[model samples]
Target: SMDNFLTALAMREEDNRSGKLSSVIFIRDRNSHGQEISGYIDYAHRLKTEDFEVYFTGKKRLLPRPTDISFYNWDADIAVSNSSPNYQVIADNPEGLLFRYKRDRKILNVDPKAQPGDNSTRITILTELYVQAVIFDHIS
Candidate 1:
């Protein structure tokens, strides 16, 4: 789960800025055996490295309502004062329903929709991984 991965990466090692949630970021971890592992729950921007890629499994479960809004807004610095700005599609399922990435308190929030206000028909998966490089720039 995302919480587990964040704990493993320990983003604080790179300074508080690493997990600032005000910009695009990735999480990387090095186990006691000295093997590094990287993963990302990309919220706003795409992966920065060519080697680090995301492969969505194309599977998801619909949410009852807009509950968690951390994924997309995690790195969002922009905001619209209006409460109902609009829904933007980030990732979608085979059903054609749009999965919108929402911004709240500058954090990533996803709303999987099937037709307007209908969420029972949407889906998403958690099987993608982000590969890292030996030396690279950017927050992780």
Candidate 2:
């Protein structure tokens, strides 16, 4: 499901910027120990880290949406706005949709056209280890 969102974004003609609809995926983050693990995926503006190295900054949180401005500042490496909720995907990211099944592989049965809409899709997959991300579909 994560790959479904990233793969779709990777192929988009437009940039992952404001006004874009987010495919924010809410994950049931867990660990091999079955303990709740929290982490943030640093997925954005990858010129290509040997084909994208999405970071798993564990023990952090997603930013809060600035009420002053509806959309986030999407061009930075990682936003400081993420609060303590769960991990979500950033909508404007255009690198690669790599859902590795967690140290597994990125992308599965993904034609990309079949992904759900921002806020329209909320995927909750309980895994041995997973993360919570904010899929930013720029708020109007």
Candidate 3:
């Protein structure tokens, strides 16, 4: 009964009017989280098979496509739906989990009233999200 989704949005909406350039925070589950909590999102899942996030140098961590080899004898979700002899950029997101910086309208542009901070845009995701790997975490 006390679940809050993007609890920051309502505040950000208020901030957009008042021009308070403060930190826009939200909530997430945390038994443990990886290193890259914030980054430029891709179609890829947030967590990979790695025990810890290893992307700090702004490097593109390319995921291994399940080959036509022996391992992929079973069916999977999401990524598998956009399969091929090679990796393809999938566009059809049935779960509404994919965060497109340009397309999706989850951004807030705060035009400051000649205050301290510079004008900036805030990109946010305001719903429960999930990611499924062929083999990963609780929601990897």
Candidate 4:
């Protein structure tokens, strides 16, 4: 099951031969997140992965609300179908979850306006998003 699927996926990209399983590493990297518009985007992309851990670094002392983070496994004719959907209630506040960033759209532009000391992007933290390692199963 893994070989056939991986080969099909690799036909698009060689790096994807391993398959994009994905795991949310964290919501935001507070220590490095700022209001530069695209500041945290590059950093977020680096944390994408198919492992199993998602943690938030900033606001280390505050409680994070649960958000609807969807994890989907894609397919051709069948369209995109969800494989796993979860809500990560970030705790610990430091040294966020250890996930290998997969470079999906979820955590890419997650924080459009996340700035140090400002909570503008907090609203996005409540919506549905994609994370690392998630295969974008599109026939296109």
lDDT minimum window of 10 residues, candidate 1: 61-70
> What TM-score would you give candidate 3 relative to the actual structure?
0.18
Can you give the lDDT of residue 106 in candidate 3? 30
| Candidate 4 per-residue lDDT over residues 24-49, each given as its tens digit | 22232221232111111111122333
Worst 10 residues of 4 by lDDT: 35-44
What lDDT, from 0 to 1, does candidate 4 have? 0.23
Q: Return whichever of 2 and 3 wins on lDDT.
A: 2
Model 1 Cα lDDT, one tens digit per residue, 31-127: 3344443322332222222121222221321111122121222122321221122223343346442323243322122222223222212122222
The lDDT, on a scale of 0 to 1, for candidate 3 is 0.24
The alpha-carbon deviation from the true structure for residue 84 of candidate 2, after best TM-score superposition, in angstroms, is 8.6
The CA lDDT of each predicted structure is 0.27, 0.30, 0.24, 0.23
Per-model TM against the reference: 0.18, 0.26, 0.18, 0.16
Ordered from best to worst TM-score, the candidate numbers read 2, 1, 3, 4
**Model number with the top lDDT:** 2
State the displacement of the C-alpha of residue 67, model 3, in Å, after optimal TM-score superposition.
32
